[PDB]
Amino acid sequence: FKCVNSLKEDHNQPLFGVQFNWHSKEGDPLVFATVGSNRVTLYECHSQGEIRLLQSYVDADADENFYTCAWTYDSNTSHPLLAVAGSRGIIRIINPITMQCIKHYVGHGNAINELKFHPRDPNLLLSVSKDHALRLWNIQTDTLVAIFGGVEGHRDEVLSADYDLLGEKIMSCGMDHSLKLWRINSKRMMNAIKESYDYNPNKTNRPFISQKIHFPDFSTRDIHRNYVDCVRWLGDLILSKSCENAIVCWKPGKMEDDIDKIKPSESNVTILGRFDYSQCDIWYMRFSMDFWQKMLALGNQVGKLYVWDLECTTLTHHKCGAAIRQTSFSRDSSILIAVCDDASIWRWDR
Ligand SMILES: CS(=O)(=O)c1ccc(-c2cnc(NCc3cccc4c3CCO4)n3cnnc23)cc1
């Protein structure tokens, strides 16, 4: 990788999220969204390292702080859509062609730390919040499918979550140092998703009833000893990190235990490996993988970018010295974008 460009957003506030749109066809514009301050900005990657500003969304609320964004598409037209959320706890769905807010979802009692769309169903949106819960939304029928939390859910702010390959289960993590598994291919969750598609407020006077999922299907606090701020599935394995200068690769149960045989009472975990690094010991630093899950990237608090080949390289630039909060690879993995605390964006081309 070589650094081919860099820019700074005029708001001068930290950029907390960056996502390439992986739903665009080959030969169609290579676009990424950045979120920071009360802004959402779209950029296009052109040849010779050129980055072109496409559109900006500025929230009507000047005190909003966006923390996350995620791309999806309309299941009937295949047109792209961008979801954004942050400190206000409001999810906004943006039409990226006009950069206008189409619709918004209220409900979390506090900030939203992460948004993720279901890998098979573009209408299923997962949000994770400082209110200790995760919420699953159906953005086609505007329904809250389920709330994951309560008694035996997270006991502190939820920082990240990820669906597995097929979206049969979710792993979440947060300030309580725990990682919890929530199966969404249970008869109860499949029926709730099915019912969310049949719901229409114009044909009934009764509200849609969301499932209250009080119990996870697995839980561990034995991987990290501090806030767990990023979790991702790697097949049936998990990659997760805290502020302890390592990404840990682990699995629930013993070495030969199949993930789908793991009971909620499972007391063991198996550590499979560690990706060690330096100077990334502050809260709120995300790692990311490319589409094919063959590369792993993580920025550190002094503007160094670590890249591992999953099949370590340190990327540095003399002008890049601020914390890199999140990175995103283009779908073909030829471009890696890094966003920083000083509102700077760095483009690295392979
Ligand atoms: C520069 S400062 O003023 O010291 C500062 C630093 C961090 C935050 C902050 C960032 N991000 C989130 N949530 C998203 C999130 C969650 C997990 C991992 C992760 C991210 C974004 C990158 O990595 N926050 C929720 N509450 N505060 C924050 C706010 C101010």
> What's the rounded Cα separation, in Å, for the pair 248 and 143?
35
Beta strand pairing call for 211-213 and 143-148: parallel
CA distance 26 to 29: 8
Distance from the alpha carbon of residue 115 to the mean position of ligand 1, in angstroms: 14
The answer to whether the CB of 59 is under 6 A from ligand 1 is no
Backbone φ and ψ of 209, nearest 5°: -100, 115
β-pairing verdict for 230-234 and 237-241: antiparallel
Question: Which atom of ligand 1 is the closest one to the Cα of 67?
Answer: 14
* Resolution, expressed in angstroms to one decimal: 1.6
Q: Which residues contact 127 (CB under 8 A, 6 or more apart)?
A: 85, 91, 108, 112, 114, 115, 134, 135, 137
Tell whether ligand 1 has an atom less than 6 A from the beta carbon of residue 230: yes
14 Cβ closer than 6 Å to some ligand 1 atom: yes
- Sequence-distant (≥ 6) Cβ neighbours of residue 187 within 8 angstroms: none
Query: How many angstroms is it from 16 CA to the middle of ligand 1?
Result: 6
Domain ranges, ordered by start, for the chain: 1-350
Q: How far apart are the first and last CA of the chain?
A: 4
